Each structure stands twice: as C-alpha cells, then as structure tokens.
C-alpha cells in the first residue's frame with residue numbers, strides 16, 4: 001500500500017490542584033520538557049521537530065503531536081503510537097521542572113462538557129481529482145466509518161446532557177457538510193488544501209472528523225480504509241451514488257445508536273444501516289483492487305481489505321466479539337460490566353470517569369493501557385518498534401532527511417518544517433535553507449549514504465548545493 | 474470479572490470531583 005499520510009493528535013491536558021497553571025503553560029511544559037530545533041514558518045508558541053521527523057507543539061492550548069509523513073497505515077499506526085509514548089514521557093519530564101506540576105494527558109477528543117479537540121488525518125492526493133467527487137463520495141463514508149473508528153462516549157449531545165452511550169466523541173460537534181472551520185460549526189469535509197509540496201501536483205486532504213484511537217487495529221482501519229476509498233475516488237471508479245439525506249443528522253443518529261440498526265436514507269431510495277453502507281464501500285474496494293492488480297496485490301492492501309470485511313461481518317453479527325479490536329467496544333464492555341455489577345444508570349459519574357480514563361496515556365493508570373498489559377487487546381506493532389519510532393524517522397519519505405539531520409547535526413539546524421531544513425553553519429553570514437518539496441524524495445535511498453559519509457553539516461550542505469533537484473525535488 | 478478488578482485498582486480517586494473538574498479548552 002502506498003499513499004503519503006500523517007496523523008495529528010491534540011491531547012487533553014489536566015493539571016489538578018495547581019492554581020498557577022493554565023492550559024498554554026502546561027502544554028508548553030510538555031513540549032519543552034521533551035525537547036531540538038524550532039519551527040520554520042517561512043506569538044510563537046513552543047514548537048519542536050523531533051529526530052523521528054515528527055512535530056511536537058502547542059496548538060489551541062493543547063499539546064499536539066503530528067507524525068512524520070509515512071506511506072502506509074501500519075507505519076501511520078507505529079509513529080502515531082510513538083506519539084503516545086512521547087507524550088507520556090514528556091509529562092514525566094515536566095514533573096521534574098522547577099514548577100513541579102503533575103500533568104495528565106488524554107488521547108481523546110472531548111471533556112464531555114461541550115469542548116472538543118482534534119485528531120486529524122492527512123492524505124496526499126492528485127491535484128487534478130475534482131473536489132466535488134471527493135465530497136460526494138467521502139461524506140457517506142465518513143458518516144458511517146465510526147462503526148469501527150469510533151472511540152465511544154458516555155453522554156449524548158455536545159453538552160453531554162442526554163443520557164446514554166454513543167459510538168463517537170466527535171459526531172455531536174459536526175454541524176455542516178463542507179467548510180474551512182476546525183474549531184466550531186465543524187464540517188464533515190474540511191476544505192483546507194496546504195500540501196507543503198508542489199501545489200501544481202498535489203492536494204493534501206485534511207480530514208478532521210475521526211476520533212483519536214487507542215486501539216492499533218482501529219487506527220490501522222481508519223487510515224487504511226480511507227486510503228483505499230481515496231484511490232477509488234481519484235480514479236473515478238465509483239459509479240454509484242452513495243449520498244444520503246441530511247448527512248449531518250445521519251452522522252449523529254448513527255453515533256447515537258450503538259445497536260447499529262439505524263437506517264440511512266440514500267438519495268437513490270435505498271435504506272441501509274451504517275454497517276451495510278460500509279459493506280458497499282468495501283465491495284467496491286475489492287473490485288477496484290481486483291480490476292487494477294489481479295492477485296498481484298501487495299500484502300498490506302490485502303490485509304486492510306480482509307480486516308475491514310471481517311470487522312463489518314462481526315459488527316453485523318454481534319459487536320461485542322470485537323472487544324479486543326475496537327475502542328468503543330472495548331470501552332463499552334467495561335462500562336456495561338460496571339452497569340451490571342453496580343446497577344448504574346448511564347448518568348453515573350463513574351461511567352464518565354471510565355470514558356475519560358480509558359484514554360490516559362500513563363501505562364500504569366490508563367484503562368486501554370491496562371487492557372494491553374493484561375493481554376486483553378490485539379496489537380498491530382510490537383513495543384520495541386514503537387520505541388524505535390520515537391527517535392528514528394520513516395525510511396521512505398522526506399521525514400528521513402529531516403529527522404536524521406536533527407539527530408546528527410542538531411546543533412547546526414536553525415529551524416525545520418515539513419518542506420524545509422535550515423542550517424546555521426559556523427563562519428557563515430547567512431542561513432542555508434534546503435527545500436524538501438517532494439514528500440517521496442529525501443528518503444534513505446536518496447540521502448542515506450550521503451548523510452552517512454558527511455561528518456559535519458558544512459560538508460553536507462556542500463554536497464547538497466546545486467543538487468536540490470536531485471536529492472529533494 | 475477479573476478485568477473489572479484491574480480497572481477498580483487504577484481508577485482515579487474522588488471520581489465525581491475528577492469528572493467535574495475535567496474541563497478543556499476547545500481545540501480543532
């Protein structure tokens with residue numbers, strides 16, 4: 001499987017019993033206590049590039065981790081999980097700062113009181129794909145993919161005043177079909193197009209509707225199935241009309257029915273549950289891959305299709321058999337256990353606590369992490385590779401050059417961003433901006449041996465000068 | 474079951490205070 005992608009996650013942040021604290025200061029402590037060089041923008045909040053090519057920064061009063069660019073959903077899972085470990089370690093380091101704050105971080109999307117914060121997916125696409133096709137084929141997919149992407153939420157309505165359990169944290173915060181907003185009146189399809197790459201070639205699709213997931217299976221499916229649907233849209237393969245009546249209303253109705261029986265009303269007259277509509281996308285994805293590649297499918301594409309179908313089949317049969325794979329099911333299984341054991345109504349405060357603490361990044365206190373520790377969750381990657389991904393970049397995108405430069409020549413890196421690395425060489429009047437405009441250049445295959453040989457940043461900039469249209473574009 | 478005892482071991486103290494105090498700034 002091959003599509004440039006990345007994940008940004010804004011973390012919930014709590015600093016109890018510290019009247020001096022505010023969210024901006026706490027978020028800064030997290031970013032600053034972990035680490036490197038500063039962000040090249042080409043009020044400046046704390047903002048750092050890590051040696052794995054990721055961005056760690058304060059955004060909207062939350063600490064945010066944005067993965068390096070990766071090429072496939074398994075790598076998306078791996079470097080996104082490295083982000084969780086980085087957050088947990090950052091908070092631990094922040095506790096040793098002079099202020100001494102105990103900072104709690106949550107990989108979730110809401111405080112259940114009316115505030116929401118974002119987990120964004122980014123996908124590189126052909127600029128030539130017409131946006132009206134992107135919108136009309138992705139809205140029904142995004143309305144329904146929460147049946148396996150949802151992280152679960154206790155409380156109904158943006159303000160949480162309705163009693164009950166729902167599939168997704170984000171659904172109640174979405175209000176329109178298409179638009180620019182990310183913090184209010186949120187659109188199912190966000191239209192911002194900032195590829196940090198050649199805008200004549202590329203669109204960057206900025207997806208904001210998904211819940212942050214703990215489960216590696218859920219994140220894998222979220223990114224992998226979306227990438228398969230994007231390939232279909234780019235190629236004009238989808239001839240059916242999947243559009244639904246009142247898609248914002250349907251997003252909320254789907255989330256609010258965890259029995260998975262609510263029926264969407266399609267414009268073409270069909271009436272399908274969210275699981276049924278997802279099965280229609282999966283069947284077209286299978287046909288697309290068969291038509292294009294035959295049995296010559298790469299193993300990851302086959303695995304995404306197989307897991308997508310197996311998940312939808314089990315969801316239609318009995319969703320609780322997925323308690324080792326999906327976040328909302330794993331969470332619901334704990335919630336229903338307490339409801340049974342203690343005769344709790346859905347408004348009980350203990351259920352709100354389980355809903356939130358499921359996403360605590362601490363290995364010893366977060367409930368998802370406790371499930372993993374007891375062997376109650378299926379994993380996609382192993383912990384040794386996660387630890388390696390905290391400090392090493394992917395080999396097959398420009399994040400390789402970015403992260404390895406910081407690791408090897410960090411003292412001489414003035415700044416970096418997704419599309420540049422800026423060197424401060426000793427004796428040089430000026431800064432040297434090395435543009436990294438192509439996401440699939442600056443990889444290990446392009447610069448790994450060069451970086452190996454160079455013993456100084458001055459040697460590297462000498463080797464790279466006049467060679468920008470070789471190494472990076 | 475056994476897993477509800479593991480969860481019980483780690484749940485935040487002062488549950489109602491914790492939930493009421495978990496108030497976030499809006500993000501994206």
Ligand SMILES: Nc1ncnc2c1ncn2[C@@H]1O[C@H](COP(=O)(O)OP(=O)(O)O)[C@@H](O)[C@H]1O
Nearest residue numbers: 005006007008066067068069122123124195197
């Ligand atoms: N050309 C590209 N295509 C797809 N994803 C990209 C591209 N360039 C960067 N990304 C990814 O997009 C995300 C950008 O994160 P961030 O800097 O937080 O963006 P934003 O401006 O949306 O807050 C990262 O996960 C990064 O890996």
Ligand SMILES: [Mg+2]
Nearest residue numbers: 008059064066
């Ligand atoms: Mg961001």
Ligand SMILES: [Mg+2]
Nearest residue numbers: 010059064501
């Ligand atoms: Mg953000």
Ligand SMILES: [Mg+2]
Nearest residue numbers: 008120206501
């Ligand atoms: Mg974003």
